[PDB]
Subunit: 414 residues, 3 copies
């Protein structure tokens, strides 16, 4: 079976890439390779990333337009309400789990908040669709007292495109016969993009191998990081594993009484792609393919939930942010009252939506939680030493939550 | 009736926003609110602006393609000739009225001209459509003697998109059966964008309220501006009122013997949206909706004239530019001969086309008239103190001229 | 016949533009005209360039999608293999001819190579289609040892768009009935863009006249250039003439036993447009029109080969690069062994693909050959004095090779 062959090839890609990176580092790593030969060594992973980012846009737009135009606006609204409830509850549970793990294990033994949320709202409503295709609104500060002035910076505004696609699909549904032509157009475009996804899946193993090989070759050494941040890394990774292997599967089983680990086997490939790429947006294409044809999720439910979740639902990001907040508080020996914990949870849950879903997109918002909850911000300099791995662990769970919620809402629809 | 309800809500939005801004300023204004809370206070207006600018592009492009493909190229050429004649004559009349008011009341008691027009011509023929969707060609100067070097700067090139849409629609018409598919596609897209416009119209009241509230909260105080520029403000606003309430309605009545104030009631909402947003491009979406369904203008005539006029026809801009030129000449006590007045009129009429139709887009060209007609340029520093209001007054009349010309050409077609 | 009238008008445009430029230079040139009047003088050529660049994008994309969707993937693969073989062989022959001419006549009596090829590969796989529509990936260097860091710089990524269009057309072919709607859509769009091309062809004469008039008016004087670079100019131009009038027609005749000069008469107009614009991308629109309706090349074969070749096949560029390499080696009296010559040929052939097909796009890569083959790079400062003409001579042959290969593959298909 080609699906099992692809899954095996992706697992072997991850393992052999770890092995190749370890062997290259033992042979000297970047210093032995040199900057030019190092850049040439990690290139296939960059090609995989580029290939995925090339199709993020048309796939997301067309799939969401078709999905929103495939349902009654009332039914679509109810489905979206349930999906948002599931996303929010899972993110809150991940935040609480992260805080609890950080408090129990005790691993620790900028932009304004208002400006961050206003930028979120601005990106939700893009001022230009073509610009939104490759730029997002971001606020910097001038001194005149700090005055916030904003501009469009590099980075696809996936959130604004998602919102516009949903709204445009609802409009097409409202049109009736006149909008059917555009529905057919976008469905055909999405099917072609899905064919491209199927072709890119076969290159995904090589890209993942080289991604992981380069990222572990880029390290100074395992000891230098772990001897100082081992308990923090353990907190983050263990929370991710508990949420993805126990909590989320538990919820799926209780609401969808089917074997969740079969569902996870059906998406092993996009999970490894998320680990390799460290971005939910780039692995979303593969996740949609697998969830549609490897599992029994309906086409419209998948194409409506997965793209929305990949931008709004981020359980790993919230867990990492809470663990980081508690770790920084413990480093400074700051007291954490119940109000303080609730504030951490709420701020992490709210910022997870604003996370751009791109590599190193959690540290940008971590300062927001460290500001809402007054804590030393400079200590983030430590987290960046291990963010290259915690971010991948976060992306894995982030896309896993999307897939499991899509399955759960498929069961609810059925 | 929902139309009358929306009109009443928009009028109440303008009035209550003025009241809210006055109350906030009396309570202290920005200093009492603070920069963060001020930014949060004016946000809904920015959201309305973003929502409108999001749909300017697809609406303009699809509507113009469909309109140009809906008529015989000869009939389309005759319609465009009549529309251009009407626009030019109305702009010349506005320029003459502004000059006459400035001379009678006597309120006054950079980029090269060639480079400005070459940039206009370049933007008319965009070098890239995707870039034109969010950028426009602009010329800066290097010293080597000043050499003009140009680049693409932020700002949608609505003029180039309009020209390309008209040309592409004519091409589709030339194709015949083969082009009908694209005509259907663009008509469906425009209808969906019009549904989005209908949804945005219901948020327009809140956005307008907050826009006006913030803009009058941003003031230092009414006295500081008026005690020095009251007669200039009076000249500009009175010329706008005379042109929009007497001259343009008079022309509409003589050429279209119907009550023009009923037509103006049919578009009160986009007029208030223009006042709030200070941009003809952003209020064009709402103007098209109203002119199509609130008045009896045909679909093709509206979708061909309104988008063209919103970029080419600007009577308020020309009136303001002439009043500013005469005001600056009177400040410096410069003599204005008949040749001088004719030059002012011609330059203002020509630059009105080049005006980008965006907030504060008239002061950019005012220097062009002050250069063609040698006058002190530095004095523009005064006008910027009141441009926030004169520009809104200009945009109101600018969109009003579009609507009335669309009605007049509808009568001519009938 | 309108075709012969257009050809005559374009030839007269070239000749009369040379005459006008010579007359203006004799009257003083830029100094007599002045910077403003000079900028106004050369404007029509810039308008022609903008008009062509406006349609490069939709034309290339839609034509390639339709062509790739019009053939069986196996047949399309065989056609592409033959086209690539022809392109590579012709480019190698041009490189060898340039090297031989430089060695016989002896006219001579930055970015890393790996980074250049990695940028080529990145542009082949664009990370964003909207960004690719007007930007291309380029690598600069930071000092930390030089570390290569890359970003998107201005310039349409025609190569990535070509690859994506071919892949998307193959995907549409794979879809079957569901993809036929998109095939029809893109065919209609390409036909409309071709109508626009037909309209732009009639303005092409004026633009070409003013282009050549300005470019020869921009000169200091013929003597200052020729008295020092005459034999190099002769080598380049004579190699181009030999390849375009003897070698390429010879190959066409042997593989397609028809009069090649009739085929060249059929494309005289795009050849002169290439000479005037100095860009294969901008003249590709006209070349497609002529090759389709002036000669007997099939629609799909043209729309598949011409856009691919205009980015991949550049015989003139390779010839110029080889002549420049040998000229610089002779200036420094560097020995050229057989290995050295083979390296020059291979590097020029490989870099010709990476050439962006835009004015002055050969000198960017010339340093790549001068680095792979260690030679003084500074001497390129001389070539820039004559690149304005050699680049045009290169573009002529570059598009001529595309047209002749399209005809040859048409014969092969027949
Ligand atoms: N730490 C995080 O989860 C940041 C976002 C993550 N890189 C993603 O794309 O899902
Ligand atoms: N003063 C003016 O009229 C400038 C243009 C105006 N802001 C508009 O968009 O119509
Ligand atoms: N010297 C060259 O051939 C560079 C590329 C050339 N300007 C073209 O577009 O074909
Ligand atoms: Na969640
Ligand atoms: Na997600
Ligand atoms: Na998010
Ligand atoms: Na007018
Ligand atoms: Na207007
Ligand atoms: Na204008
Ligand atoms: Na070749
Ligand atoms: Na070519
Ligand atoms: Na090339």
């Amino acid at each position: 079976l080609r699906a099992n062959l692809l899954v095996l090839l992706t697992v072997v890609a991850v393992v052999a890439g770890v092995a190749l990176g370890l062997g290259v580092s033992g042979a000297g790593g970047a210093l032995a390779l040199g900057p030019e030969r190092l850049s040439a060594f990690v290139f296939p992973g960059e090609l995989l990333l580029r290939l995925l980012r090339m199709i993020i846009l048309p796939l997301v737009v067309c799939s969401l337009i078709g999905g929103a135009a495939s349902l009654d606006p009332g039914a679509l609204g109810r489905l979206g309400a349930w999906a948002l409830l599931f996303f929010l509850v899972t993110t809150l549970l991940a935040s609480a789990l992260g805080v609890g793990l950080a408090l129990a294990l005790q691993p620790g033994a900028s932009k304004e908040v208002l400006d961050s949320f206003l930028d979120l709202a601005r990106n939700i409503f893009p001022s230009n669709l073509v610009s939104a295709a490759f730029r997002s609104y971001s606020t910097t500060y001038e001194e005149r007292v700090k005055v916030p002035v904003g501009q469009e910076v590099e980075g696809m505004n996936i959130l604004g495109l998602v919102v516009f696609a949903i709204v445009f699909g609802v409009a097409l549904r409202k049109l009736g016969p006149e909008g059917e032509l555009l529905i057919r157009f976008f469905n055909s475009f999405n099917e072609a993009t899905m064919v491209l996804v199927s072709w890119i899946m076969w290159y995904a193993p090589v890209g993942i191998m080289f991604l992981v090989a380069g990222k572990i070759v880029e390290m100074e050494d395992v000891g230098l990081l772990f001897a100082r941040l081992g308990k923090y890394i353990l907190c983050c990774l263990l929370g991710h594993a508990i949420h993805g292997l126990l909590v989320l599967p538990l919820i799926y089983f209780l609401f969808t009484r089917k074997n969740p680990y079969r569902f996870l086997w059906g998406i092993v490939t996009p999970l490894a792609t998320a680990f390799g790429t460290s971005s939910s947006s780039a692995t979303l294409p593969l996740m949609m393919k697998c969830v549609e044809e490897n599992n029994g999720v309906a086409k419209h439910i998948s194409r409506f939930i997965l793209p929305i979740g990949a931008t709004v639902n981020m359980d790993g990001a919230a867990l990492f942010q809470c663990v980081a907040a508690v770790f920084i508080a413990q480093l400074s020996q700051q007291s954490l009252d119940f109000v303080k914990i609730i504030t951490i949870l709420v701020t992490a849950t709210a910022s997870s939506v604003g996370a751009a879903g791109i590599p190193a997109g959690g540290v940008l918002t971590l300062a927001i939680i460290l500001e809402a909850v007054n804590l030393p911000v400079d200590h983030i300099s430590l987290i960046l030493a291990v963010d290259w791995l915690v971010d991948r662990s976060c992306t894995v769970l982030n896309v896993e939550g999307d897939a499991l919620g899509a399955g759960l809402l498929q069961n609810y629809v059925d």
